[PDB]
Amino acid sequence: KELTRNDVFSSVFQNLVSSLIVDLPNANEIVRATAQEALRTLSETTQVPIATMISPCKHILLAPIFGKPLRALPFQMQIGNIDAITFCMGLENSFLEYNEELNRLVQEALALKTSEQLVRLRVVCIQLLSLAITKPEFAAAQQRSNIRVKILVVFFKSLCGRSIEIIRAAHGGLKAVIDPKELLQNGLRPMLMNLSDHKKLTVASLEALSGLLKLKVGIGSKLLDHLLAWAQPRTLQQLGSQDLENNSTVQIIVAILDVFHLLPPTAHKFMNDLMNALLYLENNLHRCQYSPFREPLAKFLDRFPDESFEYFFNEFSKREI
């Protein structure tokens, strides 16, 4: 608590800071998190910035952080190194331009239970790229290298992927970088082609569609057509006794209803038809009190409350609605 000055911060305190820094890129996640938290609390208890404390002895981390390419290093050490990149860059100022080599390295690594480790590496890569392009200090440096368009197209390609977690990571990165129309249309063209397919849309596809629409009203009608195609023939009659919590078709159609939460802000064309379809699903499913389909409609009604309110008010006479 009583440490006062940088010269006092030197010698043994500098040794402690060096120990924390060398322990930062360690493979073990718990060790890395503990080191980060300890560094933050040690900096705050001495009333000096973290970057000021770590700048004098940054070379001990510098020696293995960039000299050894990630490809040669083992996978866990790669995760530790990239997390160290993210944490060190997350401070005020350091590594003005020399991390762009690792930027190309991570781009080429991303372009192509070990599967869980690969997923973790990919999501950390998404986070690293989003943070790197977010801060204007490195954007000003990278403007002439035209890397930002590469970052955007790689983010779009990842958002075209199948794993839901990397979809969420890419959506978060895109949200961060919002605060390119031709590139956006080019990237959404495969999404439009995928949405054109009927009865061939997975839950990850619907989640990606929702993420893209979070950024064209006929898409809603097409989703209604897919809903109807999934809905009539045999599903409701079979699911009368079968549980609805863990049937794949049920999750798919729940996603179909859910992606109607973030439709364009204008008044929805077939809201009447949407709720008639909901009544269809509820009645021929032979369920009266509760149905899982209600909560996808809850937020949809909340976002557009007025017209729904009157449309149910004029239907007050009948009990079912």
UniProtKB/TrEMBL annotation:
Top-level lineage group: Eukaryota
Membership in a protein family: Belongs to the PI3/PI4-kinase family. TRA1 subfamily.
Name of this protein: Transcription-associated protein
Residues of the full protein shown: 1253 to 1600 of 3825
